[PDB]
Amino acid sequence: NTIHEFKKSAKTTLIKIDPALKIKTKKVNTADQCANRCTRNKGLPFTCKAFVFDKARKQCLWFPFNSMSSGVKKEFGHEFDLYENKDYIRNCIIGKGRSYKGTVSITKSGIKCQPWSSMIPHEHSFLPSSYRGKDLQENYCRNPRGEEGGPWCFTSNPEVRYEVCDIPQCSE
Amino acid sequence: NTIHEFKKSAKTTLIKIDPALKIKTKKVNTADQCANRCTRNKGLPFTCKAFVFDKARKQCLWFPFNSMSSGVKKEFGHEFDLYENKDYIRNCIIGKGRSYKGTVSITKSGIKCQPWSSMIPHEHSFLPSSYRGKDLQENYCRNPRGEEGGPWCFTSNPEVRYEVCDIPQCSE
Amino acid sequence: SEMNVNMKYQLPNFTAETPIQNVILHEHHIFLGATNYIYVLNEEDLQKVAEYKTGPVLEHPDCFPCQDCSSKANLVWKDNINMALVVDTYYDDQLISCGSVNRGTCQRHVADIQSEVHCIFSPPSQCPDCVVSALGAKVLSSVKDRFINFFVGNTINSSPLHSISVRRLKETKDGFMFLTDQSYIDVLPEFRDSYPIKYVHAFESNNFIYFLTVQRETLDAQTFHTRIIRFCSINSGLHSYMEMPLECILTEKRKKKEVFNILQAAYVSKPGAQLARQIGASLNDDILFGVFAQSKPDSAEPMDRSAMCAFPIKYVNDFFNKIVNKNNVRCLQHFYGPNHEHCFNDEYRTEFTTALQRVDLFMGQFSEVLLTSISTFIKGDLTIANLGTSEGRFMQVVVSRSGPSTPHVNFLLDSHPVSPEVIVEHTLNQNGYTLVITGKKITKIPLNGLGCRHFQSCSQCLSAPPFVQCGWCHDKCVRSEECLSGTWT
Amino acid sequence: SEMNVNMKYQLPNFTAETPIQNVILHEHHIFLGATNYIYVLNEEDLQKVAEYKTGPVLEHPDCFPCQDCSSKANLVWKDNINMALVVDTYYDDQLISCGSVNRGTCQRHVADIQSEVHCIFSPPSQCPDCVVSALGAKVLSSVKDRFINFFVGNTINSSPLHSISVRRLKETKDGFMFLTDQSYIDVLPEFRDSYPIKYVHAFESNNFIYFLTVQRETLDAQTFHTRIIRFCSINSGLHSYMEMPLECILTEKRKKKEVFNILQAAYVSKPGAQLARQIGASLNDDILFGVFAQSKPDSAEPMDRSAMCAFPIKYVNDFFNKIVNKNNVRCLQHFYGPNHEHCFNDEYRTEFTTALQRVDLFMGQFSEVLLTSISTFIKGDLTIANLGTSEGRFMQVVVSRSGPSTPHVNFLLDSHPVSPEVIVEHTLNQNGYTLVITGKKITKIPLNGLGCRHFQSCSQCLSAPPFVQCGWCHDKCVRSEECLSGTWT
């Protein structure tokens, strides 16, 4: 049930701007079969790197690409749900993690990070609608401010408002 | 059931060479509860980065470290099973992936890689007992030869013996 | 160049002879409780109509409160201050006042409101109609089960009074009966001297009673604290009694940290749609708005660094419910005492530690001046607050998280500091008025605007919200109709 | 300096007058089938004991095969070559031989083995006792259901013969009855001219019959190919008949690619424990060992670049079963024909495409010379092979994936190329001997060693396996007892 592992952008799909890319489209019941099929590339002639599920058509669209691949257009669509591969999500930070988008969502001390959009416990100025450039989603530690500390999250701990998360840097 | 996600070294445990490290030890029934607990750091005062399960004592040992953390000793023990965090396994290649050890185990074209130790379809000179330095385990694409192409696997396809796997390079 | 800071505008104005304890709006009549006096005015023009005096009374211990003792040649003459004013409308439209001069002997009066007087005494070990304290108290009443229920926080000098209690008036309208002993909560006599408690506001939302208090951070802590207190509304007594600390702090978000412990005043309302999202609260939701001050070290004195911040009531309720660890919950120190039998374990009273924090809404805009009174209203989508000042200046600001908005209305009212008690009235067509105290003078201020001429740059005039529909007449900010030609931006 | 390449050692040796078609070991007697002759020897000393000649027979079409026709003054005298030799031991210990001179008219003989002769004829549209082909065939028999079953691959010049068939001898011992028509498989007459088929080895493992063939890669492909053929062992006929191509190739492992299509010979055995892991096969497991040659372009001629490689029988069985895609499975081209009715869809015969590959075990050690015969045995943990040569040189090598082992035994036998047919016998105490053909001379070679003096460096002598227990006498490699003093490393 790896569907839970892959990253979900709801109400979102992708369109390829490059002709060379090939999309594997097939109607099924649920995105669960899409995830199972892309997981092991079932009948997939390529390196499946994302898939968009359409509930209206109940159809999988499998891609050897995803959002971070160049030449791809992000499209808001309520019937479209985009899913990206974590194993195709770089899980070490380049600099201050300014571009990092992986799903590590726990404080360095080991505390559960709070949802960004929610304001409990702590209200804050940083919001997805306000801040669309960095594209924080629910709890993924980010540094939209580009703070030296790296990606941080507002702790769900009432006592501590915020904490920088722990990532292994790509220290060559 | 993330236990399936984490990487398993059977008959293996770790001992810390540094005093500062703290281990969270507790007896349970199965390593499944160890994995669930380390997954969200349940009662864990630190950034859980690995855990060793002992069947004889039925005890979890949780660690803010793992094998690749410095100052840790690898110990063969049949009653010990070490489990490492994938999200604490760098999933992009540094150079030719000479040190890469992530679990991407599919050819660039999208084919299931064959077990290293097994010889079906293809026998080969590269074996775990022979090659202990690089530490390939079942199907994780490796470059113990350090071939330019990067980590490769011998395809389970009878027609094609081998293929280089597809990794996103840490291209800053 | 920037803004004509103070410009004097003459408005409908009433002046009194004594300081005003209370201001109330009810049925086209303005009810003011001033020292020794009870003024009644026409809402439209601030023309004083009728008043009932309560002049400085004679005091003698032998004389019982209600019956007047003009035969006391031996004893003092002491001034009377109205502790609280209440208006009853579920029954006959009438006014119930209480002053400290008679040990909280409330009197009620059933155009003029001085028509009748009824001294509320019900003659015995404890006094069930010694209602209000003298040095400090807060009162708020609301119709509960067709009987107006009275919520009374009390301060005691350690010299029959209870810290907080709820009493109900008998239909005979003669006095109040304490249904239960847990209907009141008391500080221990040892600590009655220390650990001062003060009340600032009270209200109800969503079937729960909320009081706001400032008092020492802990017993023998030599440091103060702001807390809210919530409990169910049951005539029998205070059952689901809980309190927790509140904190307002602004700091850089990622990881300049200053904290304003001391509360000053507050106001309850509904938000504007734009800011409803700015705080992630529904437009229907009720929100408290608090004004806070920092303290001098281990002092109740407020330094002149003030802030305000908002609180979704659901947020506070949730923090009461689940968001805080069950371990940090501690015993009620000043009720049960540290050496409490039930400490090691309807019935219980609770005390909380990890304060709920909220960030500044004005990003420190007033880290230089002190703030006294607050009021909230909406204008279409927008929401606007009318602030009070320790100096006495008055101003209005469009409240929104989207950057700091300059005070679209600002000037300096009378010499007195702005009193906390205000009443804002909204009439249809987005015209309304604030009733604001300053010493012994009331002021009624329109909502729509106070003269667009207070602008000193084209950019300054452009920030004026569109509901004013006033703009730049090519050299100065006056509206379109008074811009002779069309060169009006 | 390095190794005295050839040193001539005199061993127990028998010489014959005609080339040897076959060599068989059974019950302390060595049975050799040579052109026109049937030699029987003592196993111990290669002393020839008795022989039955089958001299160059007269040929006349009118004369039936079995009855001799010495009355034929009109006609040719043609030489007789024994196609195959078989030994029966489940019944009386007896020897059944077949030669091409009489159109495969087998004869059987029940110390001397020439005691009796029985001409196997059972007198009709098809010939059920025209057993062996002339230009090319392979025979192997084993007791099946108490009746010796005979497996006969046949080559045809397109001039009653079947490509492959299984026949059984009647208890009367007079001839063979084809139980079914599917007991044989035939090439179509159109293609009977083309698409040549040759057989090299046959055997059985795990209740299955395996033949090894070389023939054109496809019909009208103008290119050759090596395949194995497996089918069940049922007297009725060939039911689970399948074939697949085999390839032996060495290339750099990560991603110098040369392929040796043409097979030469093979041997079936069990492995050594060290190499059992070297190939991931159980020690109990049976393994085939194949020697292969490359082809000249579109030729059956083998160039002098040879290799060998091993095959776990389970591996081949699995490749038969599941490892290959069901799509690539194709029709049997030369049986049914491309324009086959059943092609679009016990009964079926199958043909496979994607060849099973195995890597070289000698990493190209013999990309310069050509290899003819093979034999396998074990010495404690170790496993050792005795190779054959197109030149005729003989050598023995410790077979192991752990690096290439130099030939611990090497020299040059007679002028003839080493014939493919060998018989190795292992007696207790790890002493044994190979029986090897070279033209018309047999050679019996000990297993334990052939004279340790063939070494020309101390390092060279150190590589000698410990089972020889021969070492360096401080200047030359001779063993301890013949090292006078103790300076023996």
Numbering used by the authors:
A (entry chain A), B (entry chain B): 37 to 208
C (entry chain D), D (entry chain C): 33 to 107, 111 to 145, 152 to 164, 169 to 204, 210 to 305, 310 to 399, 414 to 557
What did the original publication write about this model?
C-MET receptor, which belongs to the receptor tyrosine kinase (RTK) family, plays essential roles in controlling a number of critical cellular processes such as cell proliferation, survival, motility, and morphogenesis. C-MET can be activated by its cognate ligand—hepatocyte growth factor (HGF). Structurally, the c-MET receptor is composed of a Semaphorin (SEMA) domain, a plexin-semaphorin-integrin (PSI) domain, and four consecutive immunoglobulin-plexin-transcription factors (IPT1-4) domains in the extracellular region, a single transmembrane helix (TM), and an intracellular KD. HGF, the ligand of c-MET, is secreted as a single chain 83 kDa precursor protein containing an N-terminal (N) domain, four consecutive kringle (K1–K4) domains, and a serine protease homology (SPH) domain.
NK1 is the native isoform of HGF, acting as an alternative c-MET agonist. To understand how NK1 activates c-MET, we determined the cryo-EM structure of the 2:2 c-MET/NK1 complex at an overall 5 Å resolution. Due to the structural flexibility, the entire stalk regions of two c-METs in the c-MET/NK1 complex were poorly resolved that the IPT1 and IPT2 domains of c-MET can be only visualized in the cryo-EM map low-pass filtered by local resolutions. In contrast to the binding mode between c-MET and HGF, NK1 forms a stable head-to-tail dimer on its own, which recruits two c-METs to both sides in a symmetric manner. NK1 engages with c-MET through the K1–SEMA interaction, which is virtually identical to that utilized in the formation of the c-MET II/HGF I complex. We superimposed the model of NK1 dimer onto that of free NK1 dimer, which was previously determined by X-ray crystallography. This comparison revealed no major structural differences between the free and c-MET bound NK1. Indeed, weak densities that could be attributed to heparin were observed on top of two N domains of NK1 dimer, but cannot be modeled due to the low resolution.
